[PDB]
From a paper:
The RADAR system comprises two genes, rdrA that encodes a protein with an ATPase domain, and rdrB, encoding a predicted adenosine deaminase domain protein. Here, we determine cryo-EM structures of the RADAR defense complex, revealing RdrA as a heptameric, two-layered AAA+ ATPase and RdrB as a dodecameric, hollow complex with twelve surface-exposed deaminase active sites. RdrA and RdrB join to form a giant assembly up to 10 MDa, with RdrA docked as a funnel over the RdrB active site. Our results define ATP mononucleotide deamination as a determinant of RADAR immunity and reveal supramolecular assembly of a nucleotide-modifying machine as a mechanism of anti-phage defense.
Cryo-EM analysis of E. coli RdrB showed an assembly of a rigid, higher-order complex, and we determined a structure to 2.1 Å. Structural analysis of the E. coli RdrB complex reveals three large insertions to the adenosine deaminase core that mediate higher order dodecameric assembly. Compared with a typical adenosine deaminase domain like Plasmodium vivax ADA (RMSD 2.4 Å),23 RdrB contains an N-terminal extension “insertion 1,” a unique “insertion 2” that divides the catalytic core, and an “insertion 3” after the final catalytic histidine H530. Insertions 1 and 2 form a 2-fold symmetrical interface that joins adjacent adenosine deaminase core domains. Insertion 3 forms a hydrophilic interface consisting of alternating glutamate and arginine residues that create a 3-fold symmetry axis and enable assembly of the large dodecameric shell. Some adenosine deaminases are known to function as dimers,24 but to the best of our knowledge, assembly of a large, shelled complex is a feature unique to RADAR RdrB. We made several mutations along the interfaces between RdrB protomers; charge disrupting mutations to the conserved glutamate residues that line interface 3 (E595R, E596R, and E597R) result in complete loss of anti-phage defense and demonstrate that RdrB complex assembly is essential for RADAR function. Comparison of E. coli RdrB against all structures in the Protein Data Bank (PDB) revealed that E. coli RdrB has no structural similarity to adenosine deaminases acting on RNA (ADAR) proteins, which are part of the cytidine deaminase superfamily of enzymes that use a mechanistically distinct active site to edit RNA. HPLC analysis demonstrates that purified E. coli RdrB is alone sufficient to catalyze rapid conversion of ATP to ITP.
Author numbering:
A (entry chain I): 533 to 619, 631 to 708, 714 to 798
B (entry chain A), C (entry chain H): 1 to 309, 322 to 619, 631 to 708, 714 to 798
Write the structure that this text describes.
Amino acid sequence: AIGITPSIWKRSLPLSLSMTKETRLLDLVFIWRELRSHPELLRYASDAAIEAVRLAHKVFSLEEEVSITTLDQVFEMRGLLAESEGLSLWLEEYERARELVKTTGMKRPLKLYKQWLTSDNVRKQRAEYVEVALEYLPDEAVVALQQAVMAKMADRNIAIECPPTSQYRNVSEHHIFRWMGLPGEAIEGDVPMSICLGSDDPGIFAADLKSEFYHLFVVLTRKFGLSPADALRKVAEVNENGRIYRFHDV
Amino acid sequence: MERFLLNSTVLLYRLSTVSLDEVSLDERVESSVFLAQYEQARSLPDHVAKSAWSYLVQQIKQRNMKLGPVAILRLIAEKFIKNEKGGPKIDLPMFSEWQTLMSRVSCLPIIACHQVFNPGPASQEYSFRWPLYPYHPTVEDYITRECLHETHQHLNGSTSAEECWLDALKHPEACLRDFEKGWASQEMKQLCAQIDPSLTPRIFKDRLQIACNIREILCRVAQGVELPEWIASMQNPQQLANSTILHNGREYGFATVWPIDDKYSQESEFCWLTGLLEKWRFNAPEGLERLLWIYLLIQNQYLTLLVQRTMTELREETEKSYLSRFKHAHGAGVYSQVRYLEGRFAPKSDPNKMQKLLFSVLRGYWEYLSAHMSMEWVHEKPLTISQVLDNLELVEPHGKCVELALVPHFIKRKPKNGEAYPHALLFKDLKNQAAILMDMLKSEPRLTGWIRGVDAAANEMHAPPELFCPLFRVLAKSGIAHFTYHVGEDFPHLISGIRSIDDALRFLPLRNGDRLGHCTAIGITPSIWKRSLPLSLSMTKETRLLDLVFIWRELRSHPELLRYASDAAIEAVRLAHKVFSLEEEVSITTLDQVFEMRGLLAESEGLSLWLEEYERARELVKTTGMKRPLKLYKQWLTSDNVRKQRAEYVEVALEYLPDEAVVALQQAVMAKMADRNIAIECPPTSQYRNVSEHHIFRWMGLPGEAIEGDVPMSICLGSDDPGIFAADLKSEFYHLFVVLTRKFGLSPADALRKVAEVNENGRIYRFHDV
Amino acid sequence: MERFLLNSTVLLYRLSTVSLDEVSLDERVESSVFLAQYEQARSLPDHVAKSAWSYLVQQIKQRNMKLGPVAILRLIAEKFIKNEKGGPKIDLPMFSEWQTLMSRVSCLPIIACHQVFNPGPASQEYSFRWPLYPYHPTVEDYITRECLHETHQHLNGSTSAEECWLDALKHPEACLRDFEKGWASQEMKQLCAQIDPSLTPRIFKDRLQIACNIREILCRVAQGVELPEWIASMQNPQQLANSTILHNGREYGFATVWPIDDKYSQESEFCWLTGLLEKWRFNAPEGLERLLWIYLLIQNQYLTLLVQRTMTELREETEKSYLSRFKHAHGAGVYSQVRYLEGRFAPKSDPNKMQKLLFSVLRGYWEYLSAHMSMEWVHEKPLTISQVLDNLELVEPHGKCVELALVPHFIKRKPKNGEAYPHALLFKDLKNQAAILMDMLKSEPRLTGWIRGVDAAANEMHAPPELFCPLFRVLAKSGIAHFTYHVGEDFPHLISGIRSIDDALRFLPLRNGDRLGHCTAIGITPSIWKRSLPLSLSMTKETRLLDLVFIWRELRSHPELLRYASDAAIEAVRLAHKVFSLEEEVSITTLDQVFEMRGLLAESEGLSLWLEEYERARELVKTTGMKRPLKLYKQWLTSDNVRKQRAEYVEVALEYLPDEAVVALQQAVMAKMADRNIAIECPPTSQYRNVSEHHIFRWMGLPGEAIEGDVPMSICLGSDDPGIFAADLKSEFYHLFVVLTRKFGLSPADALRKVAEVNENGRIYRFHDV
Ligand SMILES: [Zn+2]
Ligand SMILES: [Zn+2]
């Protein structure tokens, strides 16, 4: 999602895509969170906030007023174990909710999250479907969200295993090249992200890590015009990322 | 300085009160002229006026004339009118000054003087025609090829103020009846005091009678008929205030015989004036010249009062005023000057009167067409709307004649002291008028091909756009295509006007190709909008709160105006706190929710074709999260405390928002209008010294007038000048051309392109049936 | 996802095979929908489809509807159609999606559903009209002022595919006859398998009969007539495959009484569908709703097959199809929407049939004109072409109605196994057709004012342009002004298409103002021409050699492409070495000499009006130095070895020439076209995902689509969409306007200017008599 461009992500897709209300609300909250500080995307942030409050109004069947701030509070508690205190080694996260229920000001987020978890009406509304326009956010805004997630990943030093894989006609349109920073594929505000290699091709017989390495080398040398040395450097950086971020015991 | 001798309350009073044998009135004409100039054009620096008057006397004395109407008219005619090509025309460099003069003086005496003292070739028999235009071959060729399109004609009925003078003389007692029924109104008392302090209905009547009697007497001398004996008894102009004069024991009437059957027609007036000036070519009797002066002064005063403003209008409910309207829109040639004419009329609350008005309009149109094409007319003498429509169905849109599109008005009135909700009784009267219109359209479906549009004109502040939304929706379904609504004309604040335009956009059912109206609030610059205005303007709390919400909505996303958006939000929450007498906390978000429901019918569910918007509120009341907006809106509609607080007043600084922020709001509304493809009918109109400062040029994109972030908006033309006599669509087209060519330096071709784009917008956004 | 419930082979098979009392078919409708989506739009990522179907069921269930044709049609109508101004229209933002939908679904059921569940004002009596357009005042004003011009109308005869459905129902046995006579053809077997694998003529016939019977039954319920008793016996939709149903011992017919005289007319279809949906407004019987579903599916499948494709065409040889054609080109108003219409028809090999077709066309045109003007018609009832021409001579080009220009086709067929020279028998059949045409023009010289042009359409690869040059020259002398020839549509390689256009330019007798055709090869970019193509494309050796010679000719003078020119020359010499089985040395110069003689008639001198080109070769054989070119061309024409080698195949790399070189060739052909003032009729059409990638925008010069060295080429418009039902010139004009305004960001005025230039090119390069 953070490698595919909005340009080549909507190529044979219907002008309206239907999702679940829970995903729609969470997406609106995420848009607000990430575009609050963007001076050029404040309109989109505000519209996302307004739509999020509205959709929360039915999803929760709320009669009162719920602000985007308290919606954010509610949705930051998704990491809590459901059956902790609101519904040996497991003891820590059994009580992890106790700190939350101790905070005197965490009332309405807590009860709202409990409705989100247990209420049959809220669960039916969560499974409900709603339509979203393909151009709900412009390409610029989608790229801004992608680059924000990129920056988060780079800051936390989280690597991305990228094997070669529906909307790509040719392999030269793959997002691995955008991540590797090839001219014409990288976008202005991109951030390097420590891509690692993986031998996983969904629709091929008899694939190998060497096969994918050679495929990347061939694409780089023939379609991007890179010399063998430069192409080898680019593929080797990803391959070495595999070793740097290996899980093996040191 | 010549205008002050033909339009002056002081001069009229003096001349009408002193005896006709006084003689030697130069001192007093001069003093009254200076008083009139101080009252009307105060900014003359007190010595330019002295010098201008000295030059005027010098010209009169050198040319061996006497200070009087004949000399003044001769000077004006030599200065403005010539002969070129066909008939008299106005100088291109002098047309602007001529228009300013027409705002004070009637053109017919001047044209008569021109025809007498400087006639054109004695081969083109001149038939009087108003108004006088300049000549430019490019403009004439463009008019001949494309014709002119009228989209805004609703000012004095739809006729020029100059035929209203003769209509008043024809129906003096109808005019007196209207004046009295309306002089009880304060608005009117103030207006009468501001024009002529000691006017009153009685002197109004006396002045009308004096004008009629003077017209009769001067017709006698124009024909040269024997000066009847009772003229000797006539010594003091006040004697003419009455229907008869008493010479010795007997009461003689002033009436005489007139050549033309209609003695109150502008042709008759022109003939009489031409004869009088021909007889007085070399000199005139002092008393009769003073009578002519008094007649001209009375006419000009009446026209001033009329332009600055039901029954006299009812008298335009025959197939005569409309026939003259169509003949006038058509030029003097075979092919009409005006192609697509929009005809706006007030809808009547009586079905009979409505059928009446519509039959009159349609039959006048049919007669006009019959005078320009020959065809089998089915009913040679239509008597009913059905027969007139049978006749009109045969007319093809060849383009020879005018094509009519009728648009009923909707007059908005101020809310009254006690009603269920604001503008309840107004919404009612509109409901009954719309019901009559819909029953008409039913009983005659063919009337949908001639009634194309419902415009809501009248004062902006008296009813907001959100009140007309249910009516416009219901009419849309009853078969009324195209909608119009006056917005941005008069506003307590520029932000208020911009907000009104935005509310009209986002509440009215305006479809693609619809037109709004003047929309002055998004054309006038903040620089030239606060030029003689107090540093603080007072508005109503409801307008203040809505303006703050609008500012927040439009400047949320502006990185450079976030401070103003935040302050607007905070002030909006505060003002809502008293207006609603709320104890709890209301956010700007819920305020926005509350104020997006203004388009709902008040008596829908919170207080056949009407069923849809009777239940339109049910969706709102179904949404579980729309509680507090709903109850708050109900308080806004019904609560007596909230209504009193809404009518309360609060002060706002003139620089509450900087020029940059106001322009940003204007450009946001511009972008909305361009996106929805809504056109703006812009006629020429308080803060503009010169016509070159008009916002039409900003909209047209002239360098030095357009602002960086402006958006084109599809301006259409309209012949509506509030303060002129005898204006026309051709006159306004020529005025725009003259301003563009002389003040903006544009070549004739470029100026013609710019004016033609607006004119063609009239055709593109016409309401006529295709 | 709604399109897969109205156009689906799997759904049709399932619904037509299971009993009418099965009930509860949701699982299966869903599974068949996913199969249809995988078969048709494969690129949906397998979960977007799941979600879309879930949303569809959610909408149906919330609005208390049952999964079926009524619900699907209601959803589509609410989503696409409204009421604005006059009659229903499509959203401007939704028009592109509506066009894509029209490529799969018929519009009449959707318009009926809109008229039932969301009618406009009850004052505009709606008469069904196809297709549905969007509304924009600028476009409507432009159409009213300038009208639209049709230069390319040759796709399904000249009628939309939607009336062909009713024509098939009217003549089921004619349609069955055509299907069988053509199902023996391989091309057709492959097409039928690719659309519906198990189609066969027998199920074709059964489906037509089922559609007819369902139409009769549903007409009964639309009128509400007593549900005849034999409906109970009807249990399985296959029972409707036959002309009669057997209830108990008896055979009952399905026919009933119909209100309108023509029960197979689109008005009758609309009336029946409107009545059915009105009766089923709230619910419908499951069995009858399934019958309606099956009818819609059968209609859509038939239309898909028809659009993706003699006798049924012969049945359009009356003065009915042409009269409807002209009435449809004319709008609903007094003045025609289409001004200059080019009418293209296949020339018949029988003089009787040709006279027949032409009398039908001319009489339909005369009837259309008689329905719009009143004049002394000489022969009130013309019976012969001479009488119809006597009638038509009185018609002036005022502009009220359409003006017809007839253009006979020339269908090119693939060369056969054994003939004297390639396309000998084809050139023959063309010769006989041209002879018939010339004898017609002789026996009636006035027919030259109505037959203006000989177009050669059909598949490009089946006959090269050089074959038609003698025919076009002879016709030019027989009195046929203007010539047209399809080029650049389908090519084995982009270089091959560009070469074909160049050959057409330099061999056909195209004069100033002539038009070529699609010319896609010089509009499609090399970037978007190789998107799903194999890295190697195989062509014939003759095309390969000609392409190499063309590359050399065009890149000789290019300093940056000299390497490609030299390689092309070397490869051309090599390939000529086997193709000609030459032992000696042949240079590229003599190869060029050989291949410039392709315009010569084969049987001239190397193998009355025809005399000129019979001897045209004598000049060549006179030139002493033209030996080896002549003998080589004779080998090229006659030698069996050379002909076998010509039909041989060879592989060419997709990147044989770089994008730069291909663009250089395209721009060279562009420059040739601009110099010779040859226009390009560009209708909207495999490698384009979205319409914004069409080459018409490159030709129009939009930023981001035009290439640096492009040359304007006088593009004209044409209403020819290969894969849509119910398309129109107005529809394509609006589609171009919508794309320009929404995808390229152009203002309405700029977009209108760009589309208007192409439209006006249609008038400038019209073939009509001046
Ligand atoms: Zn107005
Ligand atoms: Zn074609």
